[PDB]
């Protein structure tokens, strides 16, 4: 029932390198999730 | 005939009896579900 989000930001074909993603937010939203979609600003 | 308006007024007044004065009520109901107990009541003592 917990939605966990880890994030990392880097100022740069994905680059070849190692970077560890630290935790950002942990939320007890608790709903069921099966698919997802993205939003753009245009 | 036989038709009335079921909503009647309480008509509170300061000169009424103890039982005829308005007494606000607040009811709390507690629900426990399949959620990670997001509401809780925690005392912490000073450290040594
Ligand atoms: C959550 O969604 C998935 C969708 O694939 C479903 O199979 C699963 O039974 C759902 N969980 C509950 C508790 O209904």
Curated annotation (Swiss-Prot), chain B:
Stretch list, region Disordered: 34-48
Quaternary structure and partners: Binds to host ACE2. RBD also interacts with the N-linked glycan on 'Asn-90' of ACE2. Cleavage of S generates a polybasic C-terminal sequence on S1 that binds to host Neuropilin-1 (NRP1) and Neuropilin-2 (NRP2) receptors. Interacts with host integrin alpha-5/beta-1 (ITGA5:ITGB1) and with ACE2 in complex with integrin alpha-5/beta-1 (ITGA5:ITGB1). May interact via cytoplasmic c-terminus with M protein. May interact (via N-terminus) with host bilirubin and biliverdin, thereby preventing antibody binding to the SARS-CoV-2 spike NTD via an allosteric mechanism.
Name of the protein: Spike protein S1
Consequence the record notes for mutating residue 34 to P: Increased resistance to human covalescent sera neutralization
Species classification: Viruses, Riboviria, Orthornavirae, Pisuviricota, Pisoniviricetes
Outcome after substituting residue 1 to P: In strain: Omicron/XBB.1.5, Omicron/EG.5.1
Gene giving rise to this polypeptide: S
Residues included from the entire protein: 486 to 534 of 1273
Function: Attaches the virion to the cell membrane by interacting with host receptor, initiating the infection. The major receptor is host ACE2. When S2/S2' has been cleaved, binding to the receptor triggers direct fusion at the cell membrane. When S2/S2' has not been cleaved, binding to the receptor results in internalization of the virus by endocytosis using host TFRC and GRM2 and leading to fusion of the virion membrane with the host endosomal membrane. Alternatively, may use NRP1/NRP2 and integrin as entry receptors.
């Amino acid at each position: 029932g917990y939605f966990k989000i880890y994030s990392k930001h880097t100022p740069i074909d994905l680059p070849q390198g190692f970077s560890a993603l630290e935790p950002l937010v942990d939320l007890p939203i608790g709903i069921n999730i099966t698919r997802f979609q993205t939003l753009l600003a245009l | 005939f036989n038709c009335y308006f079921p909503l009647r007024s309480y008509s509170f007044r300061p000169t009424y009896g103890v039982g005829h004065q308005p007494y606000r009520v607040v009811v709390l109901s507690f629900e426990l579900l399949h959620a990670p107990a997001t509401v809780c009541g925690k005392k912490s003592t000073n450290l040594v």
